Symmetry: D2
Subunit: 122 residues, 4 copies
């Protein structure tokens, strides 16, 4: 297989509509679902040091609320997300974070809540 | 049998809380096409109340702008502003009471192609 | 998109290893998960009448425990499953059941438990 | 916070109940490759006990042949025979105590690529 890393950006004109390092604010989804899912807002603590890794996740989505963050993926390469940007990360995709703004705030929705993380041995 | 509980969180103001259909339009994150319909995620914006259920496993709303008031069978009326989130258990009976003209809300749901049923009140 | 209907058959030689109409026996998964998932064994009540349809499901898998059943899918066509056979059905795939043995027993694992079913209007 | 409960069912004998790693080998249903790793499902057979957890959302076992005894932090030791099922909550602490030489069990799990951790007993 592999699902594809899938990125969307918010068009700046209002179009697109049809009819140690971080701290976390919990939505309560983990407790509500017994850890089947988690959802939390991640904020940067106000560069440093990109590391290829993977997560033992089924579902994983990020939506940028404030600031900017640059990710890199084994399939699609480097992508810069600003507020309104979203990144769907396939199960276990090899990726890294390249850099982020000091005001970054991003919502993460994941399954399971309690995923493991492994550094890619290159 | 047993049911999960509708789970609401609000963003403190403050900045604490961190631990170290036809009247709407939709912007797709691409998660439906990325996952073959297992999941969907989209931003919903208002364009300037009927009890119902959805055939969903997972369903979460995160308010990006404005405000929206929902009502739930289990927990009653809930007013959400930016930063507020509502986890809606599978098939929970609920309705939307009112919203702001500037409402923007992210919805994450499994599956993408859920059905909606009006609740038989009688 | 679309994920692909995925069938496996149990090799008859022990290989493959590496190192109204129906009644239902519940595993308890629906109650345990608040309807996020369901799992139950379906048995035939001891022909009749194939109807193209879809289900509002994320995940859906069948594993045949006894007897045989012939399904048909919009993507892969007709497939006959015997004991040990499995069918992964993509979210909302158009399919039908063509015929089954009178002793059919099949395990279904689904998300959500409470999916809707729609007849395909042809 | 809150946790789902390990949920066991047994097949009545009778026929009622219907309502109208290195010591094992594995046969893949194809669900991992079909779903890009969101889910996996495989049949496990014995080849003729350490507390641990898995980083899984969904996890279900259905015994096809033989018997297997598990032990759970929440509900204790459980003996399963053919037709028995065990739903294992996300990350539940558990272990396998013993099994029959002819054990065959279907496992359905999300994600396919979960990690396993030995429980720190001290
Ligand atoms: Ni990561
Ligand atoms: Ni609704
Ligand atoms: Ni069907
Ligand atoms: Ni285990």
């Amino acid at each position: 297989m592999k699902l594809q890393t899938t990125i969307q950006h918010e068009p700046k004109d209002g179009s697109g509509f049809d009819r140690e390092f971080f701290e976390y604010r919990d939505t309560g989804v983990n407790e509500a679902t017994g850890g089947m899912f988690g959802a939390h807002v991640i904020r940067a603590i106000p560069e440093a040091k990109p590391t290829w890794h993977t997560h033992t996740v089924g579902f994983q989505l990020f939506y940028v609320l404030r600031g900017w963050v640059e990710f890199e993926y084994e399939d699609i390469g480097a992508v810069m997300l600003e507020a309104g940007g979203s990144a769907f990360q396939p199960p276990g995709v090899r990726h890294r974070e390249l850099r982020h703004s000091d005001d970054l705030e991003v919502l993460e929705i994941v399954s399971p809540a309690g995923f493991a993380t492994s550094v890619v041995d290159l």
